[PDB]
Amino acid sequence: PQITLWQRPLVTIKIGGQLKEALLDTGADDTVLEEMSLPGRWKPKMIGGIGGFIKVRQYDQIIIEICGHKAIGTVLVGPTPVNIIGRNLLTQIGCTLNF
Amino acid sequence: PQITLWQRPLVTIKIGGQLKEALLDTGADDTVLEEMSLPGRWKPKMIGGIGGFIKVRQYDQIIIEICGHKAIGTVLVGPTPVNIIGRNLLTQIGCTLNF
Ligand SMILES: COC(=O)[C@@H](NC(=O)[C@@H](NC(=O)CC[C@H](O)[C@H](Cc1ccccc1)NC(=O)[C@H](C)NC(=O)[C@H](C)N)C(C)C)C(C)C
Numbered sequence: 001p002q003i004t005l006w007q008r009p010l011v012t013i014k015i016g017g018q019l020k021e022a023l024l025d026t027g028a029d030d031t032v033l034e035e036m037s038l039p040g041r042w043k044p045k046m047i048g049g050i051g052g053f054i055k056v057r058q059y060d061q062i063i064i065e066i067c068g069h070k071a072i073g074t075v076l077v078g079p080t081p082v083n084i085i086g087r088n089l090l091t092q093i094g095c096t097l098n099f
Numbered sequence: 100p101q102i103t104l105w106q107r108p109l110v111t112i113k114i115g116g117q118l119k120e121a122l123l124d125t126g127a128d129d130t131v132l133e134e135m136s137l138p139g140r141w142k143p144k145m146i147g148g149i150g151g152f153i154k155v156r157q158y159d160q161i162i163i164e165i166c167g168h169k170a171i172g173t174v175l176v177g178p179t180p181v182n183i184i185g186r187n188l189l190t191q192i193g194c195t196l197n198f
Contacts, residue, residue, distance in 0.1 A: 026125045026126070051148045054150045087107070098195055
């Protein structure tokens with residue numbers, strides 16, 4: 001679909017048997033989600049942003065459905081203020097910037 | 100032009116007689132530039148991100164040329180790690196997200 005940018009570009013994801021809202025972010029290399037119940041094993045890691053660096057928990061291989069398309073990748077669950085889908089999953093569903 | 104997202108979507112801006120590179124960011128409401136030489140007057144303000152909140156200086160009315168299109172808005176100069184062009188200028192040159 002074409003999304004214009006007069007409002008925050010928010011979308012619905014299914015991940016974990018659970019539904020949430022995420023912001024399509026073209027200036028995020030990683031997908032960071034606020035604290036949620038996910039199973040398996042994971043590594044510690046650290047992500048940078050504006051005003052900070054946070055400690056997050058790295059999960060690989062996840063089932064993420066983003067606006068009905070499926071994808072599989074690395075999801076970092078940690079203390080973000082908003083769910084962020086970043087450039088590792090965005091390429092997988094084909095999003096592009098055009099102006 | 101169509102930008103695909105396998106690399107960070109970076110573009111050239113002319114602001115202040117000076118040339119720089121900025122990331123087109125759909126998850127940033129405000130345009131935040133790292134510290135640069137701009138004239139006039141401005142207010143203190145504070146912006147949030149991942150990992151924190153920062154104090155920035157707010158200028159209104161600026162001449163920003165982003166990839167050959169012109170635009171005029173509020174630019175926040177402060178301690179970002181990278182130059183961010185946000186949703187207030189991005190609508191003015193027409194960018195859209197499509198997938
Ligand atoms: C190792 O990876 C690094 O740590 C690199 N980081 C990145 O690429 C990271 N991207 C980023 O860090 C880029 C910034 C994001 O796109 C955030 C998203 C946000 C909006 C609202 C609330 C909270 C967050 N926007 C903002 O911080 C903007 C300036 N803030 C605002 O618009 C506020 C809410 N009014 C991602 C990990 C998220 C860094 C070198 C650029």
